[PDB]
């Protein structure tokens, strides 16, 4: 029913389309833009959640915490580049 | 323990750790002192002080990590003020 | 007072249903997604303004992804976006 299901996506196509219309990014937006943006956001989130999953798994921890997020995102040089300026609250350094 | 190993031990420890190193109240008193210069009528959310200490500690740790590279490039191992001045001048601040 | 938490749980359960996540880590994710959204929308706006166009469509986000993302991330993200919009328009 919801456009996300029509696209086969989990992310809220409605909310993102609303935000795009609200944010004065342009006077007009095409119907493809919000679904495409939801797609790429869901992909990137899936990637980082995967890596954090592994960062918890080998620490034997059943539950993701920020330390795992930092351990993930700083190991992947591409995601580290994408987040090159980002600071993660309570994210310690990588051991070296 | 063998001589000097304490440094290596505590390096490995504090790299493993994640918690804040600075005392909370001293930091709060500091940021209040700095702020009251700009306006006496002031309040803080505690979370704002947390964010401030988090950002400042991250920035300091990054600057240390760079200046360590400066020191080792000079083939010292003791960090020296001129290292800090250089690293800041390279980064731009 | 919208936030992404439930969607994060959906993707989490898809990738790794075995494991929970801290509310702190959720707040990190909610920051990250908003940041990257603002960034990509800003770039798409800059593109549309540059072309003197009135509107944002798929082609603008498609180019902005190729600008903002690392090459391999772009290569996969643009594919996922193409698949998504293909399904949506076919449906």
């Amino acid at each position: 029913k919801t456009r996300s299901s029509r696209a086969g996506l989990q992310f809220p196509v409605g909310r993102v389309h609303r935000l795009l219309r609200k944010g004065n990014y342009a006077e007009r937006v095409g119907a493809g833009a919000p679904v495409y943006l939801a797609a790429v956001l869901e992909y990137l989130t899936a990637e980082i959640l995967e890596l954090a999953g592994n960062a918890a798994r080998d620490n034997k921890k059943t539950r993701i915490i920020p330390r795992h997020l930092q351990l993930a995102v700083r190991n992947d040089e591409e995601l580290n580049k994408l987040l090159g300026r980002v600071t993660i609250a309570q994210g310690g350094v990588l051991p070296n | 323990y063998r001589p000097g190993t304490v440094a290596l031990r505590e390096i490995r420890r504090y790299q493993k750790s994640t918690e804040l190193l600075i005392r909370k109240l001293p930091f709060q008193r500091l940021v209040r002192e700095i702020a009251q210069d700009f306006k006496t009528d002031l309040r803080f959310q505690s979370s704002a002080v947390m964010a401030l200490q988090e950002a400042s500690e991250a920035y300091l740790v990054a600057l240390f990590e760079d200046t360590n590279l400066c020191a080792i490039h000079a083939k010292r191992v003791t960090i020296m003020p001129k290292d800090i001045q250089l690293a800041r001048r390279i980064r731009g601040e | 007072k919208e936030s992404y938490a439930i969607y994060v749980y959906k993707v989490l359960k898809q990738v790794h249903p075995d494991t929970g996540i801290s509310s702190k880590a959720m707040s990190i994710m909610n920051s990250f997604v908003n940041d990257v959204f603002e960034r990509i929308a800003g770039e798409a706006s800059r593109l549309a303004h540059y072309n003197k166009r009135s509107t944002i469509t798929s082609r603008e986000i498609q180019t902005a992804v190729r600008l903002l993302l690392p090459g391999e991330l772009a290569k996969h993200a643009v594919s996922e976006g193409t698949k998504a919009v293909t399904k949506y328009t076919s449906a």
């Binding site: 592994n54 080998d58 620490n59 190991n75 992947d76 | 323990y1 190993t5 490995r12 493993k16 | 898809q14």
Partner: peptide, 24 residues
């Protein structure tokens, strides 16, 4: 499990447990 990355990232260790018996 439902989603899998294509990206051929290397294997990674994230374990940060360590000892001090090298120092003793």
């Amino acid at each position: 499990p439902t989603r899998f990355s294509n990206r051929q990232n290397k294997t990674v260790n994230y374990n940060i447990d360590y000892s001090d018996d090298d120092l003793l």
